[PDB]
Amino acid sequence: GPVGYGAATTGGGNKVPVNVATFEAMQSAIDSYSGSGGLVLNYTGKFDFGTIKDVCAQWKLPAKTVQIKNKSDVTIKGANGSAANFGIRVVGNAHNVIIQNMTIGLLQGGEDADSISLEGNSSGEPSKIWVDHNTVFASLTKCSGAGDASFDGGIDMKKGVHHVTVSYNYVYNYQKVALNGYSDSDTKNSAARTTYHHNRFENVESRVPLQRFGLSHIYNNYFNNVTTSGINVRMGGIAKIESNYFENIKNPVTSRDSSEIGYWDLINNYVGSGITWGTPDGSKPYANATNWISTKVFPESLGYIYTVTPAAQVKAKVIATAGAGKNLAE
Numbered sequence: 001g002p003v004g005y006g007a008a009t010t011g012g013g014n015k016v017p018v019n020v021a022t023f024e025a026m027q028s029a030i031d032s033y034s035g036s037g038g039l040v041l042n043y044t045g046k047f048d049f050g051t052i053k054d055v056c057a058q059w060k061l062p063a064k065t066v067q068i069k070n071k072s073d074v075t076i077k078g079a080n081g082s083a084a085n086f087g088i089r090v091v092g093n094a095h096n097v098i099i100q101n102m103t104i105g106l107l108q109g110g111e112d113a114d115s116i117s118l119e120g121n122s123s124g125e126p127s128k129i130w131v132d133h134n135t136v137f138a139s140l141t142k143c144s145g146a147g148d149a150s151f152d153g154g155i156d157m158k159k160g161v162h163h164v165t166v167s168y169n170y171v172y173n174y175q176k177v178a179l180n181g182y183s184d185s186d187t188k189n190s191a192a193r194t195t196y197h198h199n200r201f202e203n204v205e206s207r208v209p210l211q212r213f214g215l216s217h218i219y220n221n222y223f224n225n226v227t228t229s230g231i232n233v234r235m236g237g238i239a240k241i242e243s244n245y246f247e248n249i250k251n252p253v254t255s256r257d258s259s260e261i262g263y264w265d266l267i268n269n270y271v272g273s274g275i276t277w278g279t280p281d282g283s284k285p286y287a288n289a290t291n292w293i294s295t296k297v298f299p300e301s302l303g304y305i306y307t308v309t310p311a312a313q314v315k316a317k318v319i320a321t322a323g324a325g326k327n328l329a330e
Contacts, residue, residue: 002130004195006165009130011075011098012040021045023086035071043078047085056143059150063109078102089117093124103135103324111149120159129164135323136171153179160188170200170323181212189213200322211237220309222318223249233262240265240298245314247272253289256280263296270311
């Protein structure tokens with residue numbers, strides 16, 4: 001089950017799964033749902049990614065996104081071998097949601113190509129979310145005319161989404177991995193409480209995660225070939241960064257590009273070879289954890305029990321267990 005801030009998440013629980021073979025069948029089942037009591041969706045579709053002949057075709061097409069809006073007690077689970085060319089959004093007064101074993105790739109929409117996105121709005125803020133054992137991939141290619149946005153966020157939350165575990169996910173060939181707070185004015189995000197653990201982040205550019213405000217616990221994650229920046233903590237946010245495995249990563253632990261810096265509590269991190277550092281372009285304040293020194297003590301109890309993989313073993317453990325098609329191995 002979930003470990004960390006999303007530990008109370010049960011989603012649809014033991015309800016008999018509803019088999020959904022398509023994007024539209026999934027949305028339809030969500031729309032018909034009363035909104036609480038439990039819904040379990042078994043996604044069986046097998047999108048053939050080889051039908052996408054040009055990575056740069058995607059950004060100009062409209063997004064394909066399943067919405068869970070103001071509905072609670074939901075499990076979206078990919079069957080073994082299932083693959084989606086659509087993303088998933090949880091928005092508003094929506095609670096107790098599991099998104100699990102989905103393979104989400106090369107989405108249409110550009111700046112609108114969000115893979116898994118959790119968002120507060122005027123109606124409420126999502127909580128008790130477990131994003132677990134998914135594989136999310138796109139391309140690092142910067143398409144002609146696309147601006148900064150040939151693809152969009154991998155596993156994103158904003159506007160006060162709270163109590164969430166992001167675990168055992170595999171994110172690769174992805175420019176912008178994980179947003180947490182969408183801008184420096186997203187002050188509702190001080191409520192955010194996120195555990196990121198046992199994720200595999202490989203061949204990615206930045207936002208691993210980009211944290212604005214709130215509290216996070218980032219542990220037992222494996223980072224490799226992260227080319228711009230890794231954990232970026234901003235706007236008074238505090239991250240307990242514990243027993244991760246870092247290699248071939250630029251700016252692995254940083255605070256940059258916000259009007260105000262964020263802080264970190266560092267313990268037992270495995271720091272391998274290929275660590276580089278850079279100074280950000282611009283005027284805003286910044287900090288690079290070059291000597292791996294804590295800038296703040298994590299200010300409160302996590303309020304949950306967790307088992308730590310020895311840091312040096314995290315690479316092998318994460319490679320073995322992270323992503324879809326792994327039978328949810330832990």
